[PDB]
Amino acid sequence: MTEYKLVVVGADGVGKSALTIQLIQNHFVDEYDPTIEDSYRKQVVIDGETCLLDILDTAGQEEYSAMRDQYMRTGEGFLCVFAINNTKSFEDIHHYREQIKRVKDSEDVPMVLVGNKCDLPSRTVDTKQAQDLARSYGIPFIETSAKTRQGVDDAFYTLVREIRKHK
């Protein structure tokens, strides 16, 4: 059975854990419990292929920035999450992508840009600006909501397809 090592990254508060818990448990976490590092191994069917998703839910707190090198070396694809109502989280995406490229020593790393919290009306990052950033990276861009489940399945499955298509 093929395994896909997925890593969810992004600034503190963007909804990394809420996206992961919505994907696996089908419910929305309203609480904010900062993550250190959690892992989930889930069997799923994607495009008729039974596979194992090994998902790492990482810390956004800049205090745990030393743990990044290890998960960037082992991770096969990265879900780079920003929140559409947090401009700092959108600007921080560049730092996550640069560090991934440096650790992998490659500009072609499976990655998906995710604009989370699309259910909120307090938007500060234009969809067009995020689309333009993802185009400049050569990667897919998907808007998601861990509350409504909009784009959640699409974001994770698109990342698996990027790992499967880089292969």
Ligand X SMILES: Nc1nc2c(ncn2[C@@H]2O[C@H](COP(=O)(O)OP(=O)(O)CP(=O)(O)O)[C@@H](O)[C@H]2O)c(=O)[nH]1
One of 6, 90, 114, 117 touching ligand X (CB under 6 A) = 117
Residue 151 near ligand X by CB under 6 A: no
Shorter beta-carbon distance to ligand X: residue 29 or 164: 29
C-alpha R_g of the chain: 15
Among Mg ion, ligand X, none, partner that 131 touches (CB below 5 to 8 angstroms by kind)? none
Structure tokens at 58: 């990482």
Cβ neighbours, 10 Å, residue 95:
13
Q: Does 13 bind ligand X (CB under 6 A)?
A: yes
Instruction: Print the binding letters for residues 34-73 with ligand X: x by CB under 6 A, - otherwise.
Output: xx-----------------------xxx------------
Four-point Cα dihedral 134, 94, 33, 158, nearest 10:
30
* Nearer Cβ to ligand X (10/110): 10
| Shortest CB 64 distance to ligand X, Å | 9
Measured in whole angstroms, how far is the alpha carbon of residue 84 from the centre of its chain? 14
Residue 145, sorted as left (phi over 0), alpha (psi -120 to 50) or beta, turns out to be beta
